């Protein structure tokens, strides 16, 4: 038996979809509506009548990638939408406008990507950040990445998240800069939260592995959140769990005024839906 | 449906000789006991505290050594003298053994870079998967990555993978100055030309899933069938290795390659099964 984040969830929250075109985008919206997960503002070029006939869907004709992105952003800025979803446009096209402070979405806070996994071989939900956004986050960025993850954990009901700064090794050395940054982040929080690091992955998610290395702190063997040392590590972990460990995952960009869905071209419908679910739960 | 597995549950056997630098403690001894029970090979045990039950095995030779230095040097000389085929790092600091090995003058290395490599039988993948470097080279750049790729090619061929499909792993497919590992991947790819099947940068999904590659608009027959992954940095290699072991249920053996003989350097936290699978890999690496 175990605790799963994606068990058996509804709302009137509004997703603004930037580029509501192509089935790779629409399939997820169909599933969301069938479950009554939320409502949709669809900024797109070619209307799907059988979809736009749903009472909880509104279609806005938008002929270019740019107008779709700007349409969706303005909807969030005007407070008509709770959640921003990237559709059939380059991520860059959306991000450019999201990151313009004038648009009300980006504040003082670093944005970061975060994913939550139900891994059949782990005993509870596991969060991992940052797997897709921040490329080479240093100590400063990793502190903010951790703040975001903390906010996310709290919003979703994990009251005292065990946080582990991932690296390849537990010793702090000049040879491996990610170890020092881990130590400095752990130092930043002191007693404020449950943080440990640097930790190799085994020590983070396996109490037996932890004990064998003479480590008996919480985040070791019982991590709720892994802070990736770099983006290659976060991404690889993410993909590994999905493709080899059979994990269900939902992902979002957080740190902005609303959650942002930015899904991969080859994410599964179930995982794409998972991400919508995650964003609903982030807007409470 | 059909999967090709590198490791067998029929005891594989040999008369190759492991020289064990520091043959003490169960963390070291247990793997040896398992290998003997399987007739995997023969052992030279350089250690301080003799297990008389273990050393009553004809395939085992005990050499009383009181210091890690003497154990490291003894094991290394056994290799130089052609008395041993494989070097095993025992209950001594790694640096005490490596410092010696890494100095070319001692006879065990060439100018070729040394690297760690691991072979995985993953329940949800259809053939053995090699990943390097998960444990040794910390922040390899282009030149090191090239050498790491050379070592993986050599390992690949020796174990019977004649045309290895190699993926340089990164977070993205698109090359950008914002992510140096993408530039580095590209350069490694350029270095090899059409001498081998090598692609990169690729995210994991494009490397080990044909569907994902396609859905990403990548249609090369090389895609989704990687035999070897080259990690962009040690945190990535290590995290991936651990992920496969602890979440994916993979069996894995690993060795340090690039030197004149294979070296076993197992983690304190490697299971006995994976430590054994490591002995087994090294036997495969010296098989004539
Ligand atoms: O991203 P990038 O490719 O590294 O750099 P960009 O030029 O695209 O980023 C543009 C802006 O977004 C900012 N930015 C980059 N990553 C960010 C993040 N994860 N969170 C918030 N802002 C970010 C940049 O600092 C820059 O801000 P500024 O121009 O006001 O100083
Ligand atoms: O592809 P794209 O979205 O058109 O943009 P790019 O070519 O620059 O590459 C971005 C990729 O990483 C993803 N990406 C880019 N920025 C991202 C972010 N801030 N958060 C999550 N994913 C992001 C894109 O979704 C895309 O993923 P995919 O290849 O799995 O579809
Ligand atoms: O290991 P290290 O911290 O990098 O350096 P060491 O103190 O162990 O020195 C060992 C030598 O092996 C070299 N070395 C380090 N890693 C190596 C590798 N993966 N392969 C081959 N040689 C290596 C070092 O460069 C060093 O060479 P040098 O003495 O000519 O400077
Ligand atoms: O430095 P050192 O003190 O000489 O190395 P140690 O033997 O004390 O420990 C280093 C750790 O990294 C590993 N390690 C160090 N160098 C290594 C190498 N070249 N290849 C593989 N693993 C290595 C050790 O096996 C050990 O793993 P563990 O912590 O999981 O047990
Ligand atoms: N070759 C190995 N035994 N690798 C597993 C150990 C991983 C790494 N050396 C660590 O300390 O976390
Ligand atoms: Cl699960």
């Amino acid at each position: 038996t175990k605790s799963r984040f994606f068990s058996d969830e509804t709302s009137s929250f509004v997703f603004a979809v930037a580029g509501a075109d192509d089935e790779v985008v629409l399939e997820t919206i169909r599933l969301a509506l069938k479950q009554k997960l939320g409502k949709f503002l669809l900024f797109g070029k070619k209307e799907d009548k059988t979809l736009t006939a749903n009472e909880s869907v509104t279609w806005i004709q938008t002929d270019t990638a740019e107008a779709a992105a700007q349409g969706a952003i303005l909807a969030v800025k005007n407070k008509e939408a709770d959640i921003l979803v990237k559709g059939f446009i380059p991520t860059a096209t959306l991000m450019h406008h999201v990151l313009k402070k004038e648009n009300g979405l980006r504040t003082d806070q670093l944005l970061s990507q975060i994913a939550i996994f139900d891994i059949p071989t782990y005993h509870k939900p596991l969060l991992i950040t940052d797997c897709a956004m921040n490329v080479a986050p240093k100590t400063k960025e990793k502190i903010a990445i951790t703040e975001n993850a903390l906010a996310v954990a709290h919003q979703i009901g994990i009251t005292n998240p065990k946080i582990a700064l991932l690296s390849a090794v537990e010793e702090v050395t000049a040879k491996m800069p990610s170890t020092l940054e881990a130590q400095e982040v752990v130092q930043h929080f002191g007693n404020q939260i449950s943080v440990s690091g640097p930790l190799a992955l085994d020590v983070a998610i396996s109490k037996e592995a932890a004990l064998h290395k003479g480590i008996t702190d919480s985040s070791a063997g019982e991590a709720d959140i892994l802070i990736a040392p770099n983006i290659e590590t976060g991404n690889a972990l993410y993909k590994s769990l999905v493709y080899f460990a059979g994990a269900k995952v939902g992902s979002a960009v957080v740190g902005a005024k609303v959650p942002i869905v930015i899904s991969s071209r080859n994410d599964s419908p179930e995982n794409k839906l998972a991400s919508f679910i995650l964003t609903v739960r982030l807007v409470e």
Side-chain angles (χ1 to χ4, degrees), chain A residues 86 89-92 95 113 132-133 253 262-266:
Chain A
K86 195 200 90 234
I89 62 179
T91 298
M95 266 314 111
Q113 179 272 353
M133 186 148 185
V253 172
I262 292 170
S263 273
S264 286
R265 283 164 287 174
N266 46 39

Side-chain angles (χ1 to χ4, degrees), chain A residues 2-5 117-122 124 245-248:
Chain A
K2 59 165 302 198
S3 160
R4 299 170 171 84
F5 181 79
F117 303 77
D118 280 336
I119 306 155
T121 49
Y122 200 52
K124 57 180 178 172
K248 174 182 303 262

